[PDB]
């Protein structure tokens, strides 16, 4: 069936870089637009909990043909979305990471229903 599996989350120092992956099963990533979302840690405790789990912040997206990408303002220039069609995987490159980027990151596709993966956490902290 349709499945999305995020990986690559880690603890990173401020200013650091990371690449997240979203491995898709059940459909081809080069036939669907794919998006990254996050649920951020808004109370600076290093956890995503409670009302933080009721949020839906769009981070980045790329079109099915691969020729149109978009980013939320707060990450423009710092993050880059790409994909590897052979690995059926979408990536999110992060640079110049900030504490405000601490969040669980989720990839998303619409295959006749709206689907999100189980998420991977990035923590930006000292
Ligand atoms: Tb929290």
The residue ranges of every structural domain in the chain are: 1-126
What the block records as the tokens of 90 is 């979408």
Rounded Cα distance, 126 and 121, in Å? 16
Rounded Cα distance, 36 and 66, in Å? 15
The answer to whether residues 37 and 58 touch, using CB atoms and an 8 Å cutoff, is: yes
Judged on CB neighbours under 10 Å (0-12, 13-18, 19+), 21 is: middle
Residue 34, CA atoms < 13 Å, CB-side half-sphere: 29
Cα angle for residues 80, 78, 30 (degrees, 5° grid): 10
The pairing of beta strand 120-124 with beta strand 11-12 = parallel
Rounded Cα distance, 24 and 88, in Å? 6
The answer to whether residues 4 and 24 touch, using CB atoms and an 8 Å cutoff, is: yes
- Name which of 92, 95, 125, 96 is nearest 106 in CA terms: 92
Cα angle for residues 71, 47, 70 (degrees, 5° grid): 5
What the block records as the tokens of 125 is 């902290």
How was this model experimentally determined? Answer: X-ray
Question: How close is the Cα of 122 to the center of ligand 1, in Å?
Answer: 12
Question: How close is the Cα of 39 to the center of ligand 1, in Å?
Answer: 10
The answer to whether residues 9 and 93 touch, using CB atoms and an 8 Å cutoff, is: no
Question: How close is the Cα of 56 to the center of ligand 1, in Å?
Answer: 15
Judged on CB neighbours under 10 Å (0-12, 13-18, 19+), 9 is: middle
Question: How close is the Cα of 107 to the center of ligand 1, in Å?
Answer: 20
């Amino acid at each position: 069936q349709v499945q999305l599996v995020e990986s690559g989350g880690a603890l990173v120092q401020p200013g650091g870089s990371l690449r997240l992956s979203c491995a898709a099963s059940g459909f081809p990533v080069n036939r669907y637009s794919m998006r990254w979302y996050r649920q951020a840690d808004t109370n600076n405790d290093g956890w995503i909990e409670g009302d933080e789990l009721k949020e839906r912040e769009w981070v980045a997206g790329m079109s099915s043909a691969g020729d149109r990408s978009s980013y939320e303002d707060s990450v423009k220039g710092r993050f880059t979305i790409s994909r590897d069609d052979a690995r059926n995987t979408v990536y999110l490159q992060m640079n110049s990471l900030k504490p405000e980027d601490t969040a669980v990151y989720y990839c998303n596709v619409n295959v006749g229903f709206e689907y999100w993966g189980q998420g991977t956490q990035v923590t930006v902290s000292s």
